Amino acid sequence: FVEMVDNLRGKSGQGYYVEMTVGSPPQTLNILVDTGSSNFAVGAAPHPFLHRYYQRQLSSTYRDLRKGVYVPYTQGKWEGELGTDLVSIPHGPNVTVRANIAAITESDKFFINGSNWEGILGLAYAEIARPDDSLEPFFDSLVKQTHVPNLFSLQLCGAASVGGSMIIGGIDHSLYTGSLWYTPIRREWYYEVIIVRVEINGQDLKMDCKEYNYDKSIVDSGTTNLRLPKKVFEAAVKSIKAASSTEKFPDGFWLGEQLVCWQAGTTPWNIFPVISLYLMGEVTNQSFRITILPQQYLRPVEDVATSQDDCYKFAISQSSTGTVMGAVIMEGFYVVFDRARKRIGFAVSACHVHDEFRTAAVEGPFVTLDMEDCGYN
Ligand SMILES: Nc1ccc2ccccc2n1
């Protein structure tokens, strides 16, 4: 699996992408890896921000499905024409599969100006595929047409330029330390899971765990932030605010309406609490916990045209669609998407950014009762 190590690149805030090829002869594209959606969708037209795009006219293996897709999302949309064609992942297994491809012919606030990716690879399940659950996701086509085991794993490192690994079909033990712990995938639509308890610094929020998952908790490599429901967010910030009373910050900072900064090489780590999410484990009444450092929830703003300091953002933020465990969480851990066993595995990442005080940790087992009550209905 070492042939797939270091096959993800990116830039801070602009997600992680993997190199892929489409059609015969192979057209190379960079495609964002997104466990929060389920469509393989790629630029098929010369939008000025794109570096390259799918040119179907060049592909002998292309086939039109004679049907469009329209995908709206909060302030934005992409829109396109469905077909299938031959697909390969040069630094992935040595297969070629026939997959659905949405040729994006029109979009709005989708592509990023200055990014180096031209497509999105939805690794989530058909249930949330568009236009409907019959459009077979890439990964399902990959597994169904090859002997590639039904699992992939993600090591998101990040630093500027970022990097990582997507190991398709297995686990590489060089990318983690200690032991994998697994939490069930509650339903195969998003990668849904259940947070059963939450602790800032060690003290916990004593909230009806059900709130931690209102209406959802997901693992999502497409989102940057740890995103929490509103009550949970307030409760959470309120407690981070208190722990970190050694200094004073704008109130709108916590709300991500303002950046905050310290002089170069002068960031106060230890004024910030570790955050621990207890996830539902594999056995009744058994949980484990994942703990991230402030280097995970405090991420540098790459460049500020009107500044010259160490300006971080606060990477924790409200939400209406549930908890979303994005790069903030995933960059601390090696994450295993064990689709064959309806479960997601967490281990301390061999590359998380750690100091000489604290470390990202995955620990268990713990005894937690009534873990099902934490799921919303
Ligand atoms: N994971 C994720 C979050 C937001 C999206 C918006 C549009 C397409 C895909 C997305 N995936």
Coordinates of C-alpha atoms and ligand atoms in Angstrom, one line a residue:
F1 CA 0.0 0.0 0.0
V2 CA 3.0 2.3 0.1
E3 CA 2.3 3.2 -3.5
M4 CA -0.8 5.1 -2.3
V5 CA 1.1 6.9 0.6
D6 CA 1.2 10.7 0.1
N7 CA -1.2 10.6 -2.8
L8 CA -3.3 13.6 -1.5
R9 CA -2.4 17.3 -1.8
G10 CA -4.1 20.6 -1.2
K11 CA -4.0 24.1 0.3
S12 CA -5.2 25.1 3.7
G13 CA -9.0 25.6 3.7
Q14 CA -9.4 24.4 0.0
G15 CA -9.8 20.7 0.9
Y16 CA -7.8 17.6 -0.1
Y17 CA -7.6 16.2 -3.6
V18 CA -6.3 13.0 -5.3
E19 CA -5.1 12.5 -8.9
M20 CA -7.6 10.7 -11.1
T21 CA -7.9 9.8 -14.8
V22 CA -11.1 9.7 -16.9
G23 CA -11.8 8.3 -20.4
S24 CA -9.6 6.7 -23.1
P25 CA -7.0 8.0 -23.5
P26 CA -6.7 9.0 -19.9
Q27 CA -7.4 12.7 -19.1
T28 CA -5.7 13.6 -15.8
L29 CA -7.7 15.6 -13.3
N30 CA -7.3 16.6 -9.6
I31 CA -10.4 15.6 -7.7
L32 CA -11.4 16.6 -4.2
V33 CA -11.9 13.7 -1.8
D34 CA -15.3 14.2 -0.1
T35 CA -16.8 11.7 2.3
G36 CA -19.7 14.2 2.8
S37 CA -21.3 13.6 -0.6
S38 CA -21.9 10.8 -3.1
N39 CA -21.5 12.1 -6.7
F40 CA -18.4 11.9 -8.9
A41 CA -18.7 15.4 -10.6
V42 CA -16.1 17.1 -12.7
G43 CA -15.7 20.4 -14.7
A44 CA -16.5 19.6 -18.3
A45 CA -16.2 23.2 -19.6
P46 CA -13.6 25.9 -19.6
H47 CA -14.4 27.9 -16.5
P48 CA -11.5 30.5 -16.2
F49 CA -10.6 29.3 -12.7
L50 CA -10.1 25.7 -13.8
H51 CA -6.6 24.4 -14.7
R52 CA -8.1 21.5 -16.8
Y53 CA -11.4 19.8 -17.5
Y54 CA -13.2 16.7 -18.9
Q55 CA -13.3 16.8 -22.6
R56 CA -15.7 14.0 -23.6
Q57 CA -15.2 14.6 -27.3
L58 CA -11.7 13.2 -26.7
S59 CA -12.9 9.9 -25.1
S60 CA -13.7 6.7 -27.0
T61 CA -15.1 5.0 -24.0
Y62 CA -17.5 7.9 -23.1
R63 CA -21.3 7.2 -22.9
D64 CA -24.1 9.6 -22.4
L65 CA -26.9 8.7 -20.0
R66 CA -29.1 11.4 -21.5
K67 CA -30.1 12.9 -18.2
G68 CA -29.1 16.0 -16.3
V69 CA -28.4 16.7 -12.6
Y70 CA -28.9 20.0 -10.7
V71 CA -27.2 20.2 -7.3
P72 CA -28.0 23.2 -5.1
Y73 CA -26.4 23.9 -1.7
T74 CA -26.1 26.8 0.7
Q75 CA -25.0 29.9 -1.3
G76 CA -24.0 27.9 -4.4
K77 CA -24.8 25.2 -7.0
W78 CA -23.3 23.0 -9.7
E79 CA -25.2 21.5 -12.6
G80 CA -24.4 19.0 -15.3
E81 CA -24.9 16.1 -17.7
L82 CA -24.7 12.5 -16.6
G83 CA -22.7 9.8 -18.4
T84 CA -20.3 7.0 -17.7
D85 CA -16.7 6.4 -18.7
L86 CA -13.5 4.6 -17.7
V87 CA -11.8 5.8 -14.5
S88 CA -8.5 5.1 -12.8
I89 CA -6.6 6.4 -9.7
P90 CA -2.8 6.5 -10.8
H91 CA -1.6 6.4 -7.2
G92 CA -4.4 4.0 -6.2
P93 CA -5.1 0.3 -7.0
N94 CA -4.2 -1.0 -10.4
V95 CA -7.7 -1.2 -11.8
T96 CA -10.0 0.7 -14.2
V97 CA -13.7 0.9 -13.5
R98 CA -16.7 2.2 -15.5
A99 CA -18.3 4.8 -13.2
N100 CA -20.9 7.5 -13.4
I101 CA -19.5 11.0 -14.2
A102 CA -21.5 14.2 -13.9
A103 CA -20.0 16.6 -16.5
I104 CA -20.4 20.0 -14.8
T105 CA -21.5 22.5 -17.5
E106 CA -22.6 25.3 -15.1
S107 CA -21.8 26.2 -11.5
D108 CA -22.0 29.0 -8.9
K109 CA -19.6 29.4 -5.9
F110 CA -18.3 25.8 -6.4
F111 CA -14.9 26.0 -7.9
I112 CA -12.4 28.0 -5.9
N113 CA -10.3 30.7 -7.6
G114 CA -6.7 29.7 -7.2
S115 CA -7.4 26.1 -6.3
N116 CA -5.8 23.3 -8.2
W117 CA -8.7 20.8 -8.2
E118 CA -11.4 20.4 -11.0
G119 CA -13.8 17.9 -9.6
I120 CA -15.3 16.2 -6.5
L121 CA -15.3 12.5 -5.5
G122 CA -18.3 11.7 -3.4
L123 CA -17.3 8.7 -1.2
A124 CA -20.5 8.6 0.8
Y125 CA -23.5 6.3 -0.1
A126 CA -26.1 6.1 -2.8
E127 CA -28.9 7.2 -0.4
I128 CA -27.8 10.8 -0.9
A129 CA -26.6 10.5 -4.5
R130 CA -28.1 12.9 -6.9
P131 CA -30.5 13.0 -8.6
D132 CA -31.6 9.9 -6.7
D133 CA -30.3 6.8 -5.0
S134 CA -30.0 4.8 -8.3
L135 CA -27.0 6.8 -9.5
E136 CA -24.3 4.3 -8.4
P137 CA -21.4 6.1 -6.5
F138 CA -17.9 5.6 -7.7
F139 CA -16.7 3.6 -4.8
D140 CA -19.7 1.1 -5.1
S141 CA -18.8 0.7 -8.8
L142 CA -15.1 0.2 -7.9
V143 CA -15.8 -2.5 -5.4
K144 CA -18.6 -4.1 -7.5
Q145 CA -16.3 -4.4 -10.6
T146 CA -13.0 -5.3 -8.9
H147 CA -11.6 -7.4 -6.1
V148 CA -10.8 -4.2 -4.2
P149 CA -12.0 -4.8 -0.6
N150 CA -14.9 -2.6 0.5
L151 CA -12.9 -0.1 2.6
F152 CA -10.7 3.0 2.3
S153 CA -8.8 5.0 4.9
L154 CA -7.7 8.6 5.1
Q155 CA -4.6 10.3 6.6
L156 CA -5.1 14.0 6.4
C157 CA -1.9 15.8 7.5
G158 CA -1.7 19.4 6.3
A159 CA 1.5 21.5 6.5
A160 CA 0.6 26.7 2.8
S161 CA 0.5 23.4 0.9
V162 CA -1.1 20.3 2.7
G163 CA -0.7 16.6 2.1
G164 CA -2.1 13.2 3.0
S165 CA -2.9 9.6 2.0
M166 CA -6.0 7.9 0.7
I167 CA -5.5 4.1 1.0
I168 CA -8.1 2.5 -1.2
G169 CA -8.8 -1.1 -0.2
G170 CA -6.9 -1.3 3.0
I171 CA -5.1 0.0 6.1
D172 CA -1.4 1.0 6.2
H173 CA -0.1 0.7 9.8
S174 CA 2.7 3.1 9.2
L175 CA 0.2 5.9 9.2
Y176 CA -1.0 5.3 12.7
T177 CA 0.3 4.6 16.2
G178 CA -1.5 2.6 19.0
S179 CA -4.7 1.0 18.2
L180 CA -7.7 1.6 16.0
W181 CA -11.0 2.0 17.8
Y182 CA -14.3 1.7 15.9
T183 CA -17.6 3.4 16.1
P184 CA -20.6 2.0 14.2
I185 CA -22.0 3.7 11.0
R186 CA -25.5 4.2 12.1
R187 CA -27.0 4.4 8.6
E188 CA -25.4 4.2 5.1
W189 CA -26.2 7.6 3.6
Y190 CA -23.6 10.0 5.1
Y191 CA -21.0 8.4 7.2
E192 CA -23.2 8.9 10.3
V193 CA -22.0 8.2 13.8
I194 CA -23.2 8.9 17.4
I195 CA -21.3 11.2 19.8
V196 CA -22.3 10.0 23.3
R197 CA -20.4 12.4 25.5
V198 CA -18.3 15.5 25.1
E199 CA -15.6 16.9 27.4
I200 CA -13.7 20.2 27.2
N201 CA -10.4 19.9 29.1
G202 CA -11.7 16.9 31.0
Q203 CA -14.9 18.5 32.4
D204 CA -18.0 17.7 30.4
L205 CA -21.0 19.5 29.2
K206 CA -23.6 17.4 30.9
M207 CA -25.9 17.9 27.9
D208 CA -28.5 15.4 26.9
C209 CA -26.2 13.5 24.6
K210 CA -29.1 13.6 22.0
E211 CA -28.2 17.2 21.4
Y212 CA -24.7 16.3 20.3
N213 CA -26.4 14.5 17.4
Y214 CA -29.3 16.9 16.5
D215 CA -30.2 15.8 13.8
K216 CA -27.0 14.2 12.7
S217 CA -23.3 13.6 13.3
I218 CA -21.1 12.9 10.3
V219 CA -17.5 12.4 9.3
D220 CA -16.8 14.7 6.4
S221 CA -13.4 15.3 4.7
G222 CA -15.1 18.1 2.6
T223 CA -15.7 20.5 5.6
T224 CA -12.8 22.2 7.3
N225 CA -14.3 22.7 10.7
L226 CA -15.6 20.9 13.7
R227 CA -19.2 22.0 13.3
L228 CA -21.5 21.6 16.3
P229 CA -25.3 22.1 16.8
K230 CA -26.2 25.5 18.2
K231 CA -27.0 24.6 21.9
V232 CA -23.9 22.3 21.8
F233 CA -21.9 25.1 20.2
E234 CA -22.8 27.7 22.8
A235 CA -22.3 25.2 25.6
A236 CA -19.0 24.3 24.0
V237 CA -17.7 27.8 23.3
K238 CA -18.9 29.0 26.8
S239 CA -16.8 26.3 28.3
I240 CA -13.8 27.0 26.0
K241 CA -14.3 30.7 26.7
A242 CA -14.0 30.0 30.5
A243 CA -11.0 27.6 30.3
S244 CA -9.2 30.2 28.2
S245 CA -9.9 33.2 30.4
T246 CA -6.1 33.9 30.7
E247 CA -6.6 36.3 27.7
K248 CA -9.5 38.3 26.2
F249 CA -10.8 38.0 22.6
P250 CA -13.5 39.6 20.5
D251 CA -16.9 38.0 21.0
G252 CA -17.5 37.7 17.2
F253 CA -14.2 35.8 16.9
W254 CA -15.8 32.7 18.4
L255 CA -18.6 33.2 15.8
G256 CA -16.1 33.2 12.8
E257 CA -16.9 36.8 11.9
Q258 CA -13.4 37.9 12.8
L259 CA -9.9 36.5 12.9
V260 CA -7.6 36.8 16.0
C261 CA -3.8 37.0 16.1
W262 CA -0.6 36.9 18.1
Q263 CA 2.9 38.1 17.2
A264 CA 5.0 35.7 15.1
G265 CA 6.1 32.7 17.1
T266 CA 4.0 33.8 20.2
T267 CA 0.8 31.7 20.1
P268 CA -0.3 30.6 23.6
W269 CA -1.1 26.9 23.2
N270 CA -1.7 25.9 26.8
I271 CA -4.4 28.5 27.5
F272 CA -6.6 26.3 25.3
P273 CA -8.3 23.1 26.4
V274 CA -8.1 19.7 24.7
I275 CA -11.5 18.6 23.3
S276 CA -12.7 15.0 23.7
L277 CA -15.6 13.4 21.8
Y278 CA -16.7 10.1 23.2
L279 CA -18.1 8.0 20.3
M280 CA -20.3 5.0 20.5
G281 CA -18.2 1.8 20.5
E282 CA -18.8 -1.7 19.1
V283 CA -20.1 -3.3 22.2
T284 CA -23.2 -2.5 24.3
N285 CA -22.4 0.1 27.0
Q286 CA -18.8 0.6 25.7
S287 CA -17.4 3.8 24.2
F288 CA -14.1 5.2 23.3
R289 CA -12.9 8.8 23.0
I290 CA -11.0 11.0 20.6
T291 CA -9.2 14.0 21.9
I292 CA -7.9 16.9 19.7
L293 CA -5.5 19.7 20.6
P294 CA -5.9 23.5 20.0
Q295 CA -3.6 23.2 16.9
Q296 CA -6.6 21.3 15.4
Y297 CA -9.4 23.8 16.2
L298 CA -7.1 26.9 15.8
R299 CA -5.9 26.9 12.1
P300 CA -3.7 29.7 10.6
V301 CA -5.2 32.0 7.9
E302 CA -2.8 31.4 5.0
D303 CA -2.4 35.0 3.8
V304 CA -4.0 38.2 5.0
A305 CA -3.5 41.0 2.4
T306 CA -3.7 43.5 5.3
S307 CA -1.5 41.8 8.0
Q308 CA 1.9 40.2 8.9
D309 CA 1.3 38.1 12.1
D310 CA 0.3 34.5 13.2
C311 CA -3.5 34.9 12.6
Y312 CA -5.5 31.8 13.3
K313 CA -9.2 31.3 12.9
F314 CA -11.4 29.4 15.3
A315 CA -12.3 26.2 13.5
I316 CA -15.4 25.3 15.6
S317 CA -18.8 26.7 14.4
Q318 CA -22.6 26.4 14.6
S319 CA -24.8 24.2 12.5
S320 CA -28.3 23.3 11.5
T321 CA -27.5 20.0 9.7
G322 CA -25.8 18.4 12.8
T323 CA -22.3 17.8 14.0
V324 CA -19.8 17.6 11.1
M325 CA -16.4 16.2 11.9
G326 CA -14.2 17.8 9.3
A327 CA -10.5 18.4 8.8
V328 CA -10.3 19.8 12.4
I329 CA -11.1 16.3 13.8
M330 CA -9.7 14.2 11.0
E331 CA -6.3 15.8 10.9
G332 CA -5.6 14.4 14.4
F333 CA -6.3 10.8 13.4
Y334 CA -5.9 8.1 10.8
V335 CA -9.5 7.4 9.8
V336 CA -10.8 4.0 8.5
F337 CA -14.0 3.9 6.5
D338 CA -14.8 0.2 7.0
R339 CA -17.7 0.0 4.7
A340 CA -17.7 -3.9 4.7
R341 CA -18.4 -3.8 8.5
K342 CA -20.6 -0.7 8.8
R343 CA -18.0 1.1 11.0
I344 CA -15.4 3.8 11.2
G345 CA -12.1 3.4 12.9
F346 CA -10.0 6.0 14.6
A347 CA -6.3 5.8 15.6
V348 CA -3.8 8.5 16.5
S349 CA -2.3 9.8 13.3
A350 CA 1.3 9.2 12.6
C351 CA 1.4 12.8 11.4
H352 CA -0.8 15.0 13.6
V353 CA 0.9 18.2 14.7
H354 CA 2.0 17.7 18.3
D355 CA 4.2 19.6 20.9
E356 CA 6.2 18.4 23.9
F357 CA 3.2 18.8 26.3
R358 CA 0.1 17.1 24.9
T359 CA -0.9 14.8 22.0
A360 CA -4.0 13.8 20.0
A361 CA -5.4 10.6 21.6
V362 CA -7.7 7.8 21.0
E363 CA -8.6 6.0 24.2
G364 CA -11.0 3.3 25.6
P365 CA -12.9 1.4 26.6
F366 CA -15.2 3.5 28.7
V367 CA -18.6 2.5 30.2
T368 CA -21.4 4.7 28.8
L369 CA -25.0 3.8 29.3
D370 CA -28.0 4.5 27.0
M371 CA -25.8 5.3 24.0
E372 CA -28.9 4.6 21.6
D373 CA -30.8 7.4 23.3
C374 CA -28.2 9.7 21.8
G375 CA -29.4 9.0 18.3
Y376 CA -32.1 11.4 16.8
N377 CA -35.2 10.0 15.0
Ligands
LIG1 N1 -19.0 17.5 2.5 C1 -19.5 18.4 1.7 C2 -19.9 19.6 2.3 C3 -20.4 20.6 1.5 C4 -20.6 20.3 0.1 C5 -21.1 21.2 -0.8 C6 -21.2 20.9 -2.1 C7 -20.8 19.7 -2.6 C8 -20.2 18.8 -1.7 C9 -20.1 19.0 -0.4 N2 -19.6 18.1 0.4

